[PDB]
UniProtKB/Swiss-Prot annotation, chain A:
This is Exosome complex component RRP45. It comes from Saccharomyces cerevisiae (strain ATCC 204508 / S288c) (Baker's yeast). It is found in: Cytoplasm; Nucleus, Nucleolus. It comes from the Eukaryota. Component of the RNA exosome complex. Specifically part of the catalytically inactive RNA exosome core complex (Exo-9) which may associate with the catalytic subunits RRP6 and DIS3 in cytoplasmic- and nuclear-specific RNA exosome complex forms. Exo-9 is formed by a hexameric base ring of RNase PH domain-containing subunits and a cap ring consisting of CSL4, RRP4 and RRP40. Interacts with LRP1. Present with 4800 molecules/cell in log phase SD medium. InterPro entries: ExoRNase_PH_dom1, ExoRNase_PH_dom2, ExoRNase_PH_dom2_sf, Exosome_comp_Rrp42_subfam, PNPase/RNase_PH_dom_sf, Ribosomal_Su5_D2-typ_SF, Rrp45. Pfam families: RNase_PH, RNase_PH_C. Gene3D superfamilies: GHMP Kinase, N-terminal domain (3.30.230.70).
UniProtKB/Swiss-Prot annotation, chain C:
The keyword Hydrolase does not apply. The gene is RRP46. Present with 10800 molecules/cell in log phase SD medium. Non-catalytic component of the RNA exosome complex which has 3'->5' exoribonuclease activity and participates in a multitude of cellular RNA processing and degradation events. In the nucleus, the RNA exosome complex is involved in proper maturation of stable RNA species such as rRNA, snRNA and snoRNA, in the elimination of RNA processing by-products and non-coding 'pervasive' transcripts, such as antisense RNA species and cryptic unstable transcripts (CUTs), and of mRNAs with processing defects, thereby limiting or excluding their export to the cytoplasm. It comes from Saccharomyces cerevisiae (strain ATCC 204508 / S288c) (Baker's yeast). Its main location: cytoplasm. The keyword RNA-binding applies. This is Exosome complex component RRP46.
Curated annotation (Swiss-Prot), chain D:
It is found in: Cytoplasm; Mitochondrion; Nucleus, Nucleolus. It comes from the Eukaryota. The chain holds residues 166 to 1001 of 1001 of the full protein. Component of the RNA exosome complex. Specifically part of the catalytically inactive RNA exosome core complex (Exo-9) which associate with the catalytic subunits RRP6 and DIS3 in cytoplasmic- and nuclear-specific RNA exosome complex forms. Exo-9 is formed by a hexameric base ring of RNase PH domain-containing subunits and a cap ring consisting of CSL4, RRP4 and RRP40; DIS3 associates with the base ring of Exo-9. Interacts with GSP1. The gene is DIS3. Residues 77-211 form the CSD1 domain. This is Exosome complex exonuclease DIS3. GO terms for molecular function: 3'-5'-RNA exonuclease activity; endonuclease activity; RNA endonuclease activity; tRNA binding. It comes from Saccharomyces cerevisiae (strain ATCC 204508 / S288c) (Baker's yeast).
Swiss-Prot record, chain E:
One of its GO terms (molecular function) is RNA binding. One of its GO terms (cellular component) is nuclear exosome (RNase complex). Component of the RNA exosome complex. Specifically part of the catalytically inactive RNA exosome core complex (Exo-9) which may associate with the catalytic subunits RRP6 and DIS3 in cytoplasmic- and nuclear-specific RNA exosome complex forms. Exo-9 is formed by a hexameric base ring of RNase PH domain-containing subunits and a cap ring consisting of CSL4, RRP4 and RRP40. Belongs to the RNase PH family. It comes from the Eukaryota. Keywords: Cytoplasm, Exosome, Nucleus, RNA-binding, rRNA processing. It comes from Saccharomyces cerevisiae (strain ATCC 204508 / S288c). The keyword Nucleus applies. Present with 5150 molecules/cell in log phase SD medium. This is Exosome complex component SKI6. It is found in: Cytoplasm; Nucleus, Nucleolus. Its main location: cytoplasm. CDD domains: RNase_PH_RRP41.
RNA sequence: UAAAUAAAAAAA
């Protein structure tokens, strides 16, 4: 299945980008506002960017660690696409170019980066370990899937609580949420993912050698803008003033200076997003109990 | 596994006079079928062969037929999948001489052989080689029952791990399988398997006559 | 029977909905009629691609059964002969179980049926009639028939039931019983008392459903 | 490979020698290996100057001044014995061969441990790495006695993991040792060789059960590379002194390097000198005040989470609006709660509560009257907790588990939701409260004629701090009926305390220090001392009276399952060390013949020159005493119900139900005894009772420990912050340190030898004379210190050369 | 059991190299004439890579055919004996490998116009015989050489490089030990330009470092590019001499 | 959910 786009659309949107205009009425460095909604259960988070809707669910179960890593727990991230986000996606297509890329971006941003403290997922060394699972559900698509997913996974992990455990060797009674409160998963850092789309002016005249048409670069492109881009760039940054990961495969060849500018622009966005994410975690944490102060011991 | 139900992955499996019975045409799902049961001493083998074809292949320009054979483990998981493929390759090297391929252009014949059971008794203070002549017997029956033209009746025998398949009344050879055993058994195995062939042949011919009648 | 639903929430799909009963929340999407794969093609009728996604983990054989039962309900509902050699993708993403998924799949199935129907309505696909599904259960001591049981009620149940009926004539005439999935063991008197009280609350639901459909859709029309 | 490497070094010397020939600079190879020396002596290839370490030192011009530092004097490295076979175990058990004991590690030597055994009067010692055989303090262990050739007296050296075998580094062969350790080892061995009073020693062959929980510690900076992000094998020093250090492998060595972390032991195999564990979590920085507290509560296994939502439903629907009924015979009230009919109305009485100044959880109130027959009426009222806390509820279940309230310096940890503790059960002033009241009828000589118990509603006339009550009694201006009763209480208090001491009551002492705020509620000003007023005797004596009357009543009603509290007599062995020194030094002794002789001789342990000495000995006697223990009456026979310390035949805890669980049970048993309600079958089942006592003895102990360690922590920071100078008394003398106890805070510390002198190697230790002789730092004169010596002490930040850590250690002024 | 460091105060690394040394580079063109239209055997350090370019040729399935451009396919076979410790399982389906394959495709889709071979297919088969750090950079160089040998038109060279960072200063061309010790950056450089086809960072990297690290890599990649031109031209001179 | 000779007493 190949989507059909009119030649008229391809000429219109491209010309509009040369006039610094876009369909959804945004800027080039602007990122669509992200809305984060938490469900009743911990680990249930819904991320919304304009029309883009993604849902993440964090779950865990008692499991045994690998032989190679007796002190580390298990952690996996699932991002299987479905025709619900659009008929362009094949059901279970986990080997397609865009799918594998997205899967690899998230993995290198959360798993590989060590955003989650897997060492704190161990109950008894080389015997029993917690197995945290992050399931991302792509409900609908209006672009920015990678950005939506990173926010969804991280917000979920920071939301998530795991039943309190008392361990005495090989026997462990997992206290229920009724008996005692659940324990929040450890976090080392908060990675945020930014997606950049590159374009070509296709214009006859440039006013100056000194100042030139250069390259088109926008942030968080919509579905219509994502099909017309000539280049893809994803940079992951945090509030710790460091680059988590950056993935550029082919596309429109760009200077090292341009990448840095995108990287510096993304840093201002990930700062606002991280603080906002923490805020909505703070508002939901205080939200849960109508009578919590009456509840307290210490 | 999201395809089947494998259960808990943290668990572990359990750790601890020649006689023939031939029946064909008992499966209505395919074009030809066969049941072969053999009991010798403490060792017995029961396998089922299913034949589907000849069915037309769209766009096929082959001037002859195409045979595909696959062995399966019905119950006991003993034989390796790698070894099953090897026998399958051996079996196809046999029936490509037996089956009149010129009769089925642009067509293909799929052959499924289910090794539902084999029972082995070993005393304490190869293996699949013994099943091979029974697989050949089953397929040759299932093909003849299906209506597939065979140039000759294919049969074989197992002598000290040396399997050799015969046609044209033992005058020629359509397959040879030798594993381990002992040397200088060339002349002996050729004579012992030739007797097993002739024995398996007459019972195979009689089988068709019986059921066909 | 205080359910709540929304229609047309997804942008890149021909039709969508979000059905919620108690905890149980299911979002559904429908694209069709569209070009089918060769292996899906039906010479005369419409081909249905039905997908069910669980609230936790990946789709297993459990959801494969949810897809099968949901197929038995949606198939006779759709006027399939209107779309020969064509495809209709129907995807259900269960967002919240509302029940112990390790033991039951009752409420998730009923919510998927109601959501799928609503998504088909939104998509504008030819339907022969209307449809509604409710989960029912029976208590261990009291043996009472509880319509729309909670998760806590299911734990202490002796039998669990999924009932989906086909309605015509302004939601007053039961054309047929699309699906009845009873797991457990039964007594005849309880069954018909269940069907009598069940029909009443179902009829009340349709009336409520009609109200919701008109209230949301009328502002769009002229 | 060893010969190649030696040849490599030799090649380097050969190269350097040839390379530096034009500059007339030779090279000297300092090696103790006989292979390199022989290869150079033969002079086969090139000329290389090879000297051994000792041989090289003897070529320095100043041989004398640096000689003394230098030491003078199929192979398998030592290893721990394998755990005994089960067949061997069951064969030994049947033949009488083996016994198992709970190993308590000594508090200043982590390599000395003891195990109590019935056969033996003193604790059987277990000494050294090998004989300890990988045990941890707490572990259930099986021991075997060693031959008498191996028996030892209590060690005369102090030790921890941080300061033993400090060379070794964990990983996931040849071994060497340090000169002080060597010499220290020689001195210790010599001490062992000559000492009289050796004691039974054993060795660990198996462990019945293990005390590995999650623990708290901080990394050894000396095992960590602070600037490397690689994963690292490293050493964790645990917060408990007794525990051996632990080897863990961690990706975050450098990040965790100034964190107070939590770890868990995974194994301790024969072929590893240290246990292996693994990182669990990071509580935050080592200076963090908050994390130390969370750390403290983990080390003590104390719950402090918000009470389970489940618990809340048990709490009354109307929360803070809850009100004692106006009319006890009110019909709506009587339907909502039928037990009310049996409740007495004691409000007309003049009840007051005497509690500590920041006391919000008030357990009890008292009242007085003069009866027309000349006798006095004295009554005691206690929070009616079991009216609100019902058996089998989630609230009872959380309280039973918690077992006790835990009081930290900056925190109070509640057993019960504070709606109960600080509002509805608290005997608040001016508000009608339910209560359990025992009222006596006694004469002017404070002799009990009769005693009664009941469930009642009372109104608190006034809630006092202790001082206000004393002033109102003293002033002589106020002679109202209430004050006249208060003086009557004090007069009878003197009589009761007199008779009790004559009966053989103990008078131990440990008046710990207190802390005060500035105008700000969290800004601290001063450290002071709480003074015992005559009213304090006044509350304690009537609490004692309440508890004794209650124990007799409930043991009467339930002879098999009564909730009681006993206290064993100390063995003479408990007082062996303390008694001998006093007798030797001053020829003055304390008598173990009875508790009265114990109390009287203790009273007479007086130094006229210094008042404090008597308190020093009193606090040191307290340490010796065996643990008092809750028990159910059916577990022992009557003579074993004995409370030694209190010199009464039967005792229990009744007076504090809100803050202890024992009381809750006693309360139910008393309500059972008086026919107010039937006793829950839970407290009539010996097996459930036995499990309850086990738990609450454990929760009681843990709470005492946590209490003390919070005080020690804050006091430790506070003295340093002040720069203040405070006196200390010497209660222990080892070969390499002393232990001082402080009167103001009453907290012991260890001053280590190399924190007492710039030169340890010249120190004299005498084990008969209990004497340490040394040359102080910042001074030149030899100093003698003995046990019982008044000294002066202070705290400052020392950095250890061996341990790269810079903690704030206790020093001698 | 042993322990090791990264960069000594003497400016020496674990293997003996200093902070700015490229490993031994050997390059080889037309190694498999009877197996592919273009072929290259790469030896960059202990890394050993066979690269085969088969095409442009007829697609095996008409379903997969583009009438505007050629279809470019890349399959990387990391053999089970590439490392010191033989891997039990195959690495073919591994998500890490799928990302690598995808990454390489994205890179060269913009580097070959791929508009002059319509209705054809270019299949690139790669066999990694031995691995020792910077395998991604070596994969890039192997494809570029093999493609040129096949006479397939492209706009410019694409050179791949490996970067190692310790403290203040990164180390050029990292091996497995260094890769294990510290985070690395893999750079795809087009021709002699400053434009990157591939920027790959999988581990944590201080933000201050990258600008300087990039500068070192680009300079080193230029040297690598110069060597490649020398490697092919030198071979041509050698081949001509052999002919003579 | 096992099990000790592991700090007396009072109020917190
Ligand atoms: Mg009080």
């Amino acid at each position: 299945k190949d989507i059909e786009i009119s030649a008229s659309e391809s000429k219109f949107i491209l010309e509009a980008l040369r006039q610094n205009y876009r369909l959804d009425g945004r800027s080039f460095d602007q990122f669509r506002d992200v809305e984060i909604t938490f469900g009743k259960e911990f680990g249930d988070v819904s991320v919304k960017m304009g029309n883009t809707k993604v849902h993440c669910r964090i779950s865990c179960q008692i499991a045994q660690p690998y032989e190679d890593r007796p002190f580390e727990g298990l952690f996996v991230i699932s991002t299987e696409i479905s025709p619900m986000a659009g008929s362009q996606f094949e059901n279970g297509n986990i080997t397609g170019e865009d799918e594998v890329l997205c899967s690899r971006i998230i993995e290198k941003s959360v798993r590989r980066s060590g955003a989650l403290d897997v060492e704190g997922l161990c109950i008894v060394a080389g015997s029993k370990c917690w197995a945290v699972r992050a399931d991302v559900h792509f409900l609908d698509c209006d672009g920015g899937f990678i950005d939506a997913s990173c926010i969804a996974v991280m917000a979920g992990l920071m939301h998530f609580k795991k039943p309190d455990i008392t361990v005495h060797g090989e026997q462990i009674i997992v206290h229920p949420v009724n008996e005692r409160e659940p324990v929040p998963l450890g976090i080392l850092h908060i990675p945020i993912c930014v997606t950049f789309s590159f374009f070509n002016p296709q214009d006859t005249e440039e006013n100056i050698k000194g100042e030139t048409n250069s390259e088109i670069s926008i942030i968080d492109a919509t579905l219509k803008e994502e099909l017309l881009r000539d280049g893809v760039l994803t940079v992951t940054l945090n509030k710790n003033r460091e680059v988590v990961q950056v993935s550029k495969a082919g596309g429109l060849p760009m200077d090292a200076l341009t990448l840095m500018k995108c990287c510096h622009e993304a840093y201002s966005i990930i700062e606002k997003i991280t603080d906002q994410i923490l805020q909505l975690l703070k508002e939901d944490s205080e939200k849960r109990n109508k009578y919590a102060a009456m509840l307290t011991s210490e | 596994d999201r395809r089947r139900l494998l259960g808990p992955a943290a668990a572990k499996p359990m750790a601890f006079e020649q006689e023939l019975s031939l029946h064909t045409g008992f499966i209505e799902n395919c074009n030809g079928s066969a049941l072969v049961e053999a009991r010798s001493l403490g060792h017995q083998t029961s396998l089922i062969s299913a034949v589907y074809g000849p069915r037309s292949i769209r766009g096929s320009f082959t001037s002859q037929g195409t045979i595909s054979i696959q062995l399966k483990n019905g119950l006991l998981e003993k034989y390796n999948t790698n070894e099953l493929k090897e026998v399958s390759s051996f079996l196809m090297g046999i029936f490509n001489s037996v089956v009149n391929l010129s009769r089925y252009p642009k067509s293909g014949i799929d052959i499924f052989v289910y090794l539902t059971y084999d029972k082995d008794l070993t005393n304490n203070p190869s293996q699949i080689s013994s099943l091979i002549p029974h697989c050949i017997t089953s397929i040759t029956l299932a093909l003849a029952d299906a209506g597939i033209e065979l140039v000759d009746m294919a049969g074989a025998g197992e002598a000290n791990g040396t399997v050799v398949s015969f046609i044209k009344n033992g005058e020629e050879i359509v397959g040879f399988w030798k594993d381990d055993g002992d040397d200088e058994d060339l002349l002996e195995c050729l004579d012992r398997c030739k007797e097993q062939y002739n024995r398996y042949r007459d019972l195979m011919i009689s089988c068709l006559m019986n059921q066909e009648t | 029977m205080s359910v709540q639903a929304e229609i047309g929430i997804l942008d890149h799909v021909d039709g969508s909905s979000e059905f919620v009963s108690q905890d149980t929340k299911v979002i559904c999407s429908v694209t069709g009629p569209i070009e089918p794969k060769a292996r899906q093609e039906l010479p005369t009728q419409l081909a249905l691609e039905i997908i069910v996604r669980p609230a936790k983990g990946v789709a297993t054989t459990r959801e494969k059964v949810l897809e099968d039962k949901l197929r038995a309900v949606l198939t006779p509902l759709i006027t399939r002969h209107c779309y020969p050699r064509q495809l209709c993708q129907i995807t259900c993403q269960i967002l919240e179980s509302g029940e112990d998924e390790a033991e039951f799949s009752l409420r998730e199935l009923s919510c998927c049926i109601n959501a799928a129907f609503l998504a088909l309505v939104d998509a504008g696909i030819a339907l022969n009639s209307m449809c509604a599904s409710i989960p029912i259960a029976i208590i261990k001591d009291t043996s009472d028939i509880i319509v729309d049981p909670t998760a806590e009620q299911l734990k202490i149940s002796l039998s669990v039931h999924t009932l989906a009926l086909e309605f015509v004539n302004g939601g007053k005439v039961v054309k047929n019983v699309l699906l009845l999935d009873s797991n457990g063991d039964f007594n005849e008197d309880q069954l018909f008392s269940l069907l009598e009280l069940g029909e009443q609350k179902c009829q009340e639901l349709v009336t409520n459903i009609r109200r919701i459909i008109q209230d949301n859709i009328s502002p769009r029309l002229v | 490979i060893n010969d190649r490497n030696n040849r490599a070094i030799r090649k380097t010397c050969q190269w350097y020698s040839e390379h530096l020939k034009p500059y007339d600079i030779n090279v000297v190879l300092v090696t103790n290996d006989r292979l390199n020396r022989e290869a150079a002596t033969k002079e086969v290839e090139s000329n290389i100057i090879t000297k051994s370490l000792v041989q090289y030192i003897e070529l320095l011009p100043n041989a004398d001044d640096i000689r003394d530092s230098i030491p003078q004097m199929t192979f398998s490295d030592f290893t721990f014995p394998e755990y005994y076979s089960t067949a061997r175990v069951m064969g030994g058990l049947k033949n009488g061969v083996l016994y198992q004991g709970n190993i308590q590690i000594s508090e200043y030597n982590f390599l000395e441990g003891s195990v109590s055994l019935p056969r033996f009067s003193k604790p059987v010692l277990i000494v050294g790495q090998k004989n300890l055989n990988r045990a941890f303090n707490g572990d259930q262990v099986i021991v075997e006695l060693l031959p008498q050739s191996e028996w030892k007296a209590p060690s005369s050296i102090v030790l921890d993991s941080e300061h033993f075998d400090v060379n070794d580094n964990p990983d996931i062969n040849t071994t060497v040792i340090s000169d002080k350790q060597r010499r220290l080892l020689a001195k210790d061995a010599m001490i062992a060789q000559r000492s009289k009073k050796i004691q039974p020693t054993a060795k660990v062959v198996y462990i019945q059960r293990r005390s590995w929980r999650q623990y708290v510690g901080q990394l050894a900076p000396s095992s960590v590379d602070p600037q490397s992000s690689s994963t690292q094998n490293v050493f964790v020093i645990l917060m408990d002194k007794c525990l051996p250090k632990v080897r863990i492998r961690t990706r975050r060595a450098a990040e965790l390097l100034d964190k107070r972390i939590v770890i868990s032991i995974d194994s301790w195999p024969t072929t590893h000198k240290y246990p292996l564990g693994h990182f669990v979590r990071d509580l935050g920085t080592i200076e963090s005040a908050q994390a130390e507290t969370e750390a403290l509560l983990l080390e003590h296994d104390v719950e402090y989470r918000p009470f389970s939502k489940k618990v809340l439903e048990c709490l009354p629907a109307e929360g803070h609006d809850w009100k004692a009924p106006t009319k006890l015979d009110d019909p709506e009230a009587v339907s909502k709660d039928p037990l009310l009919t049996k409740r007495k109305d004691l409000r007309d009485k003049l009840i007051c509560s005497i509690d500590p100044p920041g006391c919000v959880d008030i357990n009890d109130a008292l009242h007085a009257k003069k009866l027309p027959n000349g006798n006095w009426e004295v009554g005691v009222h206690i929070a009616d907790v079991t009216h609100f806390v019902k058996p089998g509820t989630a609230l009872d279940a959380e309280g039973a588990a918690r077992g006790t309230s835990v009081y930290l310096v900056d925190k109070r940890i509640d057993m019960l939701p504070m709606l109960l503790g600080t509002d509805l059960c608290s005997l608040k002033p001016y508000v009608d409260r339910f209560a359990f009241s025992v009222i006596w009828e006694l004469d002017d000589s404070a002799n009990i004629v009769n005693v009664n118990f009941m469930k009642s509603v009372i109104r608190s006339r006034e809630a006092f701090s202790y001082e206000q009550a004393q002033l109102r009694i003293d002033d002589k201006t106020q002679n109202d009926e209430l004050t006249m009763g208060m003086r009557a209480l004090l007069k009878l208090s003197v009589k009761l305390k007199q008779k009790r001491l004559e009966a053989g009551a103990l008078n131990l002492a440990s008046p710990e220090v207190k802390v005060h705020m500035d105008s700000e509620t969290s800004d601290p000003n001063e450290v002071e001392i709480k003074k015992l007023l005559a009213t304090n005797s006044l509350v304690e004596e009537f609490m004692l009276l309440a508890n004794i009357s209650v124990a007799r009543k409930i043991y009467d009603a339930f002879p098999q399952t009564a909730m009681l509290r006993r206290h064993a007599a100390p063995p003479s062995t408990n007082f062996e060390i303390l008694n001998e020194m006093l007798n030797t030094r001053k020829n003055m002794s304390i008598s173990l013949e009875s508790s009265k002789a114990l109390a009287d001789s203790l009273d007479r342990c007086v130094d006229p020159e210094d008042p404090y000495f008597n308190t020093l000995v009193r606090i040191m006697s307290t340490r010796c005493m065996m643990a008092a223990q809750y028990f159910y009456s059916g577990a022992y026979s009557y003579p074993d119900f004995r409370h030694y310390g209190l010199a009464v035949d039967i005792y229990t805890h009744f007076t504090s139900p809100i803050r202890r669980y024992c009381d809750v049970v006693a309360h139910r048993q008393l309500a059972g005894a008086i026919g107010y309600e039937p006793l829950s079958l839970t407290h009539r089942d010996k097996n459930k009772m036995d499990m309850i006592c086990r738990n609450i003895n454990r929760k009681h102990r843990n709470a005492q420990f946590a209490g003390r360690a919070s005080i020690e922590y804050y006091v430790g920071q506070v003295m340093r912050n002040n720069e203040s100078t405070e006196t200390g008394y010497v209660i222990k003398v080892f070969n390499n340190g002393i232990v001082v106890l402080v009167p103001k805070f009453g907290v012991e510390g260890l001053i280590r030898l190399d924190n007492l002198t710039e030169d340890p190697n010249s120190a004299a230790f005498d084990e008969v004379e209990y004497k340490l002789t040394f040359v102080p730092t910042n001074s030149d004169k030899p100093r003698d210190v003995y046990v019982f010596d008044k000294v002066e002490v202070q705290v400052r930040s020392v950095m250890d050369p061996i341990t790269s850590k810079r903690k704030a250690e206790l020093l001698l002024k | 059991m042993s322990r090791l460091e990264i960069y000594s105060p003497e400016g020496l690394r674990l293997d003996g190299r200093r902070w700015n040394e490229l490993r031994r580079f050997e390059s080889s063109i037309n190694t498999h004439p009877h197996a592919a239209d273009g072929s290259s055997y790469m030896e960059q350090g202990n890394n050993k890579i066979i690269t085969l370019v088969k095409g442009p040729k007829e697609p095996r399935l008409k379903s997969q055919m583009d009438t505007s451009k050629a279809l470019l396919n890349v399959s990387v076979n990391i053999t089970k004996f590439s490392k010191f410790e033989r891997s039990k399982s195959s690495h073919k389906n591994e998500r890490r490998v799928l990302e690598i394959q995808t990454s390489l495709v994205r890179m060269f889709e913009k580097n070959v116009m791929l508009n002059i071979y319509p209705r054809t297919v270019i299949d690139i088969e790669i066999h990694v015989l031995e691995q020792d750090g910077g395998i991604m950079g070596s994969l890039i160089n192997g494809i570029t050489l093999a493609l040129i040998d096949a006479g397939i038109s492209m706009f410019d060279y694409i050179s791949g490089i490996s970067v190692g960072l310790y403290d203040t200063t990164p180390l050029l061309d990292t091996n497995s030990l260094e890769e294990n010790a510290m985070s690395t950056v893999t750079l795809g450089v087009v021709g002699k330009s400053e434009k990157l086809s591939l920027l790959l960072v999988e581990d944590k990297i201080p933000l201050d470092r990258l600008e300087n690290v990039l500068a070192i890599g680009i300079a080193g990649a230029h040297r690598v590019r110069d060597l490649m031109d020398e490697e092919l031209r030198k071979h041509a001179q050698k081949r001509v001499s052999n002919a003579s």
